[PDB]
Amino acid sequence: ALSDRLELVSASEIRKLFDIAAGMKDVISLGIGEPDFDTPQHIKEYAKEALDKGLTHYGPNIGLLELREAIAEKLKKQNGIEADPKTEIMVLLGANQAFLMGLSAFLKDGEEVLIPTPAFVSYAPAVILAGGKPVEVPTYEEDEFRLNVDELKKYVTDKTRALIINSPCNPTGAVLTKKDLEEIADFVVEHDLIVISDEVYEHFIYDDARHYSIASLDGMFERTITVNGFSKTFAMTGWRLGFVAAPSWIIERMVKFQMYNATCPVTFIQYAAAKALKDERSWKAVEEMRKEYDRRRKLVWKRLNEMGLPTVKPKGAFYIFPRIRDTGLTSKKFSELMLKEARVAVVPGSAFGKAGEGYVRISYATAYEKLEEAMDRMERVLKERKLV
Amino acid sequence: ALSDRLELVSASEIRKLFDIAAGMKDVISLGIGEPDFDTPQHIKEYAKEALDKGLTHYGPNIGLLELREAIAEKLKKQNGIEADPKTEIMVLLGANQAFLMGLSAFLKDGEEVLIPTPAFVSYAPAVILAGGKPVEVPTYEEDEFRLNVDELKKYVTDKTRALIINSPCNPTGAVLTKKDLEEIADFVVEHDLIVISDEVYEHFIYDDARHYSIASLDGMFERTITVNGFSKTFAMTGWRLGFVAAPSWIIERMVKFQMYNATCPVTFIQYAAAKALKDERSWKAVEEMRKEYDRRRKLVWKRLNEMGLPTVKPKGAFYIFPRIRDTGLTSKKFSELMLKEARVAVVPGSAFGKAGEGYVRISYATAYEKLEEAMDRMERVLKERKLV
Ligand SMILES: *Cc1c(COP(=O)(O)O)cnc(C)c1O
Numbered sequence: 001a002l003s004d005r006l007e008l009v010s011a012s013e014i015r016k017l018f019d020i021a022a023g024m025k026d027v028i029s030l031g032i033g034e035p036d037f038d039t040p041q042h043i044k045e046y047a048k049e050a051l052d053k054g055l056t057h058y059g060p061n062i063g064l065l066e067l068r069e070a071i072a073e074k075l076k077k078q079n080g081i082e083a084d085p086k087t088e089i090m091v092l093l094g095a096n097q098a099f100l101m102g103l104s105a106f107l108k109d110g111e112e113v114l115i116p117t118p119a120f121v122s123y124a125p126a127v128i129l130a131g132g133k134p135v136e137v138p139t140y141e142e143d144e145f146r147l148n149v150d151e152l153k154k155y156v157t158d159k160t161r162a163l164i165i166n167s168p169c170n171p172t173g174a175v176l177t178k179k180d181l182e183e184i185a186d187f188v189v190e191h192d193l194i195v196i197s198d199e200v201y202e203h204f205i206y207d208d209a210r211h212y213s214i215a216s217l218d219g220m221f222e223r224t225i226t227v228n229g230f231s232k233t234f235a236m237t238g239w240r241l242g243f244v245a246a247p248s249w250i251i252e253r254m255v256k257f258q259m260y261n262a263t264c265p266v267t268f269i270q271y272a273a274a275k276a277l278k279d280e281r282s283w284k285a286v287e288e289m290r291k292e293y294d295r296r297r298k299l300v301w302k303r304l305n306e307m308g309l310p311t312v313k314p315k316g317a318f319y320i321f322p323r324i325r326d327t328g329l330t331s332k333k334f335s336e337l338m339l340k341e342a343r344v345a346v347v348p349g350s351a352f353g354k355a356g357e358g359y360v361r362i363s364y365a366t367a368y369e370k371l372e373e374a375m376d377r378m379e380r381v382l383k384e385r386k387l388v
Numbered sequence: 389a390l391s392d393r394l395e396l397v398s399a400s401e402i403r404k405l406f407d408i409a410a411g412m413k414d415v416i417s418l419g420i421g422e423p424d425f426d427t428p429q430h431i432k433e434y435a436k437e438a439l440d441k442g443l444t445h446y447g448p449n450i451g452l453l454e455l456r457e458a459i460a461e462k463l464k465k466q467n468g469i470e471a472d473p474k475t476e477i478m479v480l481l482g483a484n485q486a487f488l489m490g491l492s493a494f495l496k497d498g499e500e501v502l503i504p505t506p507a508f509v510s511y512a513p514a515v516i517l518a519g520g521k522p523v524e525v526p527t528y529e530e531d532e533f534r535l536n537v538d539e540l541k542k543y544v545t546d547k548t549r550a551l552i553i554n555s556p557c558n559p560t561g562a563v564l565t566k567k568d569l570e571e572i573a574d575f576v577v578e579h580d581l582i583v584i585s586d587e588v589y590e591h592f593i594y595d596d597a598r599h600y601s602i603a604s605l606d607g608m609f610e611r612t613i614t615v616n617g618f619s620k621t622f623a624m625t626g627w628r629l630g631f632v633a634a635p636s637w638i639i640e641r642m643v644k645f646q647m648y649n650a651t652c653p654v655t656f657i658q659y660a661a662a663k664a665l666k667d668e669r670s671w672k673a674v675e676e677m678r679k680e681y682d683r684r685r686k687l688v689w690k691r692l693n694e695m696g697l698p699t700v701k702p703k704g705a706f707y708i709f710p711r712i713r714d715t716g717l718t719s720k721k722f723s724e725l726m727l728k729e730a731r732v733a734v735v736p737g738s739a740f741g742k743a744g745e746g747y748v749r750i751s752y753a754t755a756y757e758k759l760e761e762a763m764d765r766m767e768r769v770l771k772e773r774k775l776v
């Protein structure tokens with residue numbers, strides 16, 4: 001029963017870190033997994049307008065047609081994904097819902113789900129809740145944390161049914177290249193898996209990174225659940241609005257699940273988001289947020305490497321995953337040390353899976369000036385403790 | 389696995405009825421399961437205010453503390469329920485989430501959940517999805533559809549772990565009296581069950597009906613999940629905001645579930661509801677809505693009985709459950725006939741359980757004028773077809 005599955009999901013480390021940052025005040029948090037920016041004013045105005053229009057009643061379980069149609073245009077133009085808004089696109093209460101509900105559309109007892117790690121915290125638990133078995137597949141610092149298909153091959157079994165990829169990746173900042181995805185696509189077809197692609201950080205890419213969607217590749221739409229949303233893109237985490245594009249058989253099953261879950265997303269919020277997707281100011285806003293993230297990104301990368309922590313320059317999202325294993329401490333000891341002595345909160349890498357151990361996640365979705373001081377604080381402690 | 393449980397849930401009849409009203413245009417729908425009223429303007433203004441204050445980021449999985457504190461006050465004053473906002477109250481994306489997540493905090497494999505019927509459509513599927521077995525407990529029109537402990541005693545087994553109660557009841561409009569609840573409480577305690585009390589229609593009570601909460605009864609809070617929300621009370625169905633009050637051990641397991649589900653409710657929306665609870669204009673609006681519902685309620689009750697369909701006078705919610713079995717037609721055939729010839733949509737009682745067969749649900753959450761016309765159309769065909 002779900003209760004048994006829930007008991008199997010272990011308590012969150014990020015959770016434990018919050019409650020420990022609570023009794024402290026002088027702490028600069030680098031463990032924040034959301035934009036520090038507020039929602040663009042024009043999006044707020046569209047929401048107000050929707051309220052004035054009285055869009056306060058139930059909407060379809062699949063979401064507002066107008067939004068689904070707006071999503072179809074976005075998926076096609078930006079991601080090369082051709083999806084029917086009437087049957088293949090579903091709006092959700094945040095993209096987070098897509099994992100539990102998407103997996104529940106097909107996952108059977110004991111079936112395995114490959115999860116490249118370090119990975120987003122919701123993956124493994126969603127697999128366990130759906131009735132499956134999470135199988136962590138390590139990604140390496142040497143590959144700039146880009147999933148290597150040769151690693152995937154070590155973990156496949158007759159029970160493997162799905163694969164969850166996340167690019168740009170939380171917590172590494174790794175961006176899968178077109179060829180990475182092409183090889184991954186072949187592997188998925190070879191073992192007849194369903195692949196869930198988490199693309200919420202798509203617009204926050206840097207250097208020569210470019211966002212490709214696996215579902216756009218030849219023969220992939222039939223076996224891919226593309227997950228995305230407005231939380232990171234438009235700084236709308238508190239608005240709880242995400243979506244998926246998948247074959248209609250999967251969509252039908254997710255809407256049925258929704259009928260006995262959250263029912264439907266917020267009506268006036270969907271209206272705001274549909275209008276936002278067609279508003280030029282939305283793209284201007286995203287671009288300026290991307291530019292600021294990039295500025296902070298270069299700061300933390302330089303600082304971390306120069307203070308003595310070998311750190312891969314992330315090409316996407318707003319996280320950096322410095323190596324702390326050489327200090328001789330575990331990811332937890334490191335975080336515990338930084339919090340009490342540097343008054344800086346960083347998430348231990350182990351919270352993102354076994355392969356995360358030896359690292360720590362730092363989010364640069366915080367004021368540049370706070371980042372500057374957080375870096376100085378960490379470096380001082382590293383120097384005083386002779387850890388570097 | 390969840391996918392297996394999902395396949396066990398049948399396709400919704402209400403769903404089948406919408407798509408069949410779609411290709412038709414002269415139809416008055418009496419199948420509306422939500423308020424026809426708009427959300428009170430001042431609540432809309434509070435939401436707009438929250439947007440201006442930038443309450444657009446993630447909030448706690450359990451919900452904003454300010455809203456939980458406002459709900460604690462509401463539960464104490466209005467329901468006589470003493471609950472700690474910090475650990476015993478959780479905000480959700482609609483009250484609908486409470487059933488799947490609430491049952492998942494404890495229900496084991498094959499464990500039974502007594503469900504009084506005619507019942508709300510989300511009850512049995514939530515039990516199935518949680519991993520248990522739904523056991524229908526009929527309620528009778530001669531009892532004004534008030535749940536009878538005589539019936540519960542016949543359906544309990546050693547496998548029974550929970551009981552779901554709904555007063556005011558959707559679809560019957562029945563309201564459990566204080567003594568009913570006291571007797572139900574005894575039964576729940578005797579069989580060591582957890583009772584989930586769905587009180588979303590609490591404020592729409594009529595005649596001498598008074599709303600009591602089972603969790604307020606002696607020693608009941610420890611084994612009760614009180615489910616409520618803002619969807620019906622304030623006309624906020626499209627806002628997706630409900631809540632539960634329960635023992636902290638249940639609440640803890642529910643927030644953990646949420647972490648891998650919707651994460652947290654809409655931030656600025658929770659701010660709006662917290663303000664609304666303390667605003668006299670909100671309660672003034674509830675009173676006006678209840679007054680209008682009552683006016684419509686008396687019309688439909690009188691019209692239904694006089695046209696030849698024996699109908700129990702509902703004391704709560706905004707639904708009326710006429711008996712149609714005397715016409716010789718099944719609930720589905722009666723709904724088919726009314727849609728085809730009267731151009732009036734009513735939902736077959738069978739969609740709410742076996743005990744619902746022989747009845748039909750009519751919602752009076754629609755304009756008085758539309759109700760008058762629908763009654764006229766229905767009576768015309770009942771007479772034309774010699775069904776009365
Ligand atoms: C933030 C995030 C999501 C989804 O967030 P929602 O707020 O639920 O839309 C999904 N995946 C990753 C890796 C994220 O960081």
Ligand SMILES: *Cc1c(COP(=O)(O)O)cnc(C)c1O
Pocket residue numbers: 262263421481482483484485508554557558586588617618619620625628629630
């Ligand atoms: C409308 C309703 C609910 C909950 O609705 P939400 O919109 O999810 O808050 C719960 N129970 C019954 C019987 C209802 O009619």
